[PDB]
């Protein structure tokens, strides 16, 4: 099981301890998705930043490449070269 955590809010008005926690967690920019294997340690860290973050549990995690592939929009065309 994995927490899919997302940095919903910015870190602009945020104090330095909370910023440091966010950095440790692994979230860079706003809406930067990160999957974390569930445990007590990561849960407590997420609780510490509960108002900046959106968490949701998952069966499986996704690698960055997979996430990118999921994101990619449908090109509404099929090329045929001649």
């Amino acid at each position: 099981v994995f927490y899919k955590v997302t940095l919903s809010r910015s870190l602009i008005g945020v104090p330095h301890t909370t910023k440091s926690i966010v950095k440790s967690l692994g979230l860079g920019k706003r809406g930067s998705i990160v999957y974390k294997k569930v445990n007590p340690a990561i849960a407590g860290s997420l609780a510490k930043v509960k108002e900046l973050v959106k968490v949701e549990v998952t069966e499986h995690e996704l690698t960055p490449s997979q996430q990118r592939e999921l994101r990619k929009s449908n090109p509404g065309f099929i090329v045929e070269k001649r």
Binding site: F2, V38, P40, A43, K48, V55, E56, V57, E59
Partner: protein, 119 residues
């Protein structure tokens, strides 16, 4: 006070709705955190994900902060909270010992659910 910080003493309807939504989101986050931990513990014992989700007896979190957050006396949910504590902080130097939450700096990020028992 020649510089004009034109901030109204009370919130609009739309502001209040947004605040409520934010409060609800933090409760949801907490719920997710507890749920994931429970699922993990079920897996450790030796159940599948689906089985864990089904389980009648949900495991309560052992770490302290999480356990406190779960308690409504310490950290109440938005549905539990009073109208007043959603939209008014305690401010000892204000008249009424109360102040709009929107007047708190970084109120959109910072959480503040519980006020004192009689203030």
């Amino acid at each position: 006070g020649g510089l004009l910080w034109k901030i109204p003493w009370r919130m609009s309807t739309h502001q209040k709705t947004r605040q409520r939504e934010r409060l609800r989101n933090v409760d949801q986050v907490i719920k997710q955190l507890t749920l994931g931990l429970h699922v993990q513990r079920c897996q450790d014992k030796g159940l599948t994900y689906q089985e864990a989700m089904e389980s009648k007896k949900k495991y309560k979190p052992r770490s302290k902060s999480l356990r406190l957050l779960n308690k409504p006396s310490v950290f109440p949910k938005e549905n539990q909270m009073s109208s007043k504590d959603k939209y008014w902080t305690f401010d000892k130097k204000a008249v009424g010992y109360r102040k709009g939450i929107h007047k708190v700096p970084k109120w959109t990020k910072i959480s503040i659910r519980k006020a004192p028992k009689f203030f």
